[PDB]
RNA sequence: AAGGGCACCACCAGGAGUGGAGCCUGCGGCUUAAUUUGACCAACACGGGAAACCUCACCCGGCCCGGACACGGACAGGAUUGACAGAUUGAUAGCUCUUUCUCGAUUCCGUGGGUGGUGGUGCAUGGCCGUUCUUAGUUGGUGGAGCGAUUUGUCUGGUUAAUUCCGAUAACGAACGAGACUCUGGCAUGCUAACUAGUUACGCGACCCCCGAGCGGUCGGCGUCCCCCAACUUCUUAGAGGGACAAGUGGCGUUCAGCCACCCGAGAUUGAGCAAUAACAGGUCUGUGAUGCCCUUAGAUGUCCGGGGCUGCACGCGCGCUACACUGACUGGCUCAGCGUGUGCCUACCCUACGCCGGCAGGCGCGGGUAACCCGUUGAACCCCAUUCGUGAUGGGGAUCGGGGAUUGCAAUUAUUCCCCAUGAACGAGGAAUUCCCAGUAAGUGCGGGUCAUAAGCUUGCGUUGAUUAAGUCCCUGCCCUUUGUACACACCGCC
């Protein structure tokens, strides 16, 4: 109805949300090996999967980082309470993730390697 | 200045009202489909949004 | 109970949308529901043509970006109540569903 | 920054209540979406956290147009004594159910 | 540069001594030597100005000229 | 210099033009306080750059700190914050100023140190993009020839749009590019379906009929998923599939690679997207919380507010619009589209049916649409059919200019746009030159999208009407391969 946004604007909005979420995670989990983000959004609650090489890092001590990131994305995008979760998964074959290798090369060059 | 002229100028419309949602720029904006994004920024995030290139 | 529900599906890639259209209707046949065929609404093409350059200097090249939106409608209309009979949507990421009765 | 004390405490307890802070980079925005009732301007929120970052009690990440401050352990005890708390109350991020 | 206007003087507050603007008599009966701000939010605690023709509340901004 | 091949960013044969006129717009110049600035095939309706404010970077002024943090002073006997009146100011900026109130540790001063910057540097850079080049080109490994740079592979020849293939072969085996690929167009009375698409049928009507038709003709009038209260998918939509392969015939060819013609076929070459090695001191620091260095940082090169400018005109150029008329203009009648948009995180601003008022632009109420449901059977233009004009700068052309009326906005003057009445200027097919183009193409013609409170002479797409010429060449301008010459290597815009 009137409250609902049109499908044309709607599907553009979801692409905007994914692009904005990817950029935020790219800047934050860069040194942690962030590979990509998968968003399985459902009408009831959405869910966000973070693809990173070093999962025990994206999840801090007792999962403080993930709880923070879950709260941080909750406030920015106005998600309703308890309707969004963040999962962290290890990406298989990290040598075939161009993002992971490019981030690894960035870290090596910043270290001082030739 | 004092609370009655710092932002006093009306900005309900025009280029000043609208800025890129990514880089806060006011030039070459794309307000179609509710993007509100920069001409250059859209080319950067076109793949992530879903705008692929067919022809 | 007596119910009639209009299920509308919308996505970007046809392969997933055609897949999800299958298991709802195929699940309903096993559930011996009546199923009007999946009506294919005309595909919406969102076309944004942006100049390729970020400088304004060049040979006036323009970049054509297309976004295809595909909509499909499935009308599950069994004699008995349907919401309890169809308690699942069994979707995949990328497709949006909107359960809707005849009142809307 | 010349923000009133009531606004400054309002930012701090909100930052403590959940150990994260999100604010859009807009100094002319009349009110922060959270704490709109306190009538704290968005400018006060941005500048208050900038002071915390320089002192090291918070770490800042900026996306397109939103700050994403995360309260650190060095900020746990500082907000604890500013609001006069013994080491028992934690931000939501620090503990859930444990 | 070489701007024609001389650099504008910015205000330095006078630095006033402690208020002490109410006195007593014969070992102490209170007598406010200024004016009370009558508004609800000014209240009793604050006092009004004593200009040469009006009285002014620092918070409530009320002004009372005797013409 | 020779031998071969190729290209409407080359020509030929033509078409439409541009250059000539008025106007729009972008450059240069001139002018200015400023008329911000980049760019000079591959700049000049380009920076998505249609700027009243904002944008804004320029000019004339006026506020603010949005100068973190540390250290030292200063301070609850007040560090500091706001403010009424008068003056003052462009200003209802307590910016100053008299005046005292008020605030309460949030600041204030100094020293270090931030931070910001549409400030410089694209000749410090990333990324992107343009171009060399959309031509067919490019590179290892092992082997061979060389003292060596290098060379062979990567070729005499035939063929191809293509170092594409066929073949010889000190080369063999490969890699990228091309091709394959992706999207789109053309055909499927074959499949799946559709009360958000329809068609046929039936039943109601409404009319014309009437001779009498009667299963008559017309209806975008109404029903039959208002589920029992039609079918079907031809037309519409969109999925899975099929279809075209030089497949068949004849000829040419080393009878190989392939080429030409024809039958059957919707189609025997539909358009795009992607697009190699190497490079350019090509463009962008004015897209970015991309960035190095430098500069500025409280009388700011930060930021905000007011006004002006970006439009300014002896002149030169570029992209276009309108025309010069009768193959026309005007007035009326008739009758046909397709892309595609439509109410907003911030964010204020949507597309509009119908009724009424008005001559028009418009105004006022009532609805519909977050959309195959409403605008909308998108009743578009050209065109078509009738009328007037009649070869004159004329009813061509509508520039310039006066008066008046609306809409947007906080604000319309240097006219935002629109409407009405008046003036009716050059212009009678445009010198030398020069652009684009091979079939639903050029061109005529309108309609959407972007920009957009207001708006298109721009651009990006769409449909409509629909040709002339050509199936060739290297003549001009260039490209590719081989041979050759060279005093050239910043590479003929070279050297001397
Ligand atoms: Mg006339
Ligand atoms: Zn942008």
Short mmCIF file of C-alpha atoms (C1' of nucleotides) and ligand atoms in Angstrom, two decimals, chain F residues 329-330 394-396 398, ligand 1:
data_model
loop_
_atom_site.label_atom_id
_atom_site.label_comp_id
_atom_site.label_asym_id
_atom_site.label_seq_id
_atom_site.Cartn_x
_atom_site.Cartn_y
_atom_site.Cartn_z
"C1'" A F 329 1.45 28.03 -43.74
"C1'" C F 330 -3.39 28.46 -41.52
"C1'" U F 394 3.09 37.44 -48.12
"C1'" G F 395 -1.30 34.35 -43.65
"C1'" G F 396 6.75 32.68 -44.82
"C1'" G F 398 9.24 35.04 -35.23
MG1 LIG G 1 -0.88 35.31 -40.86
#
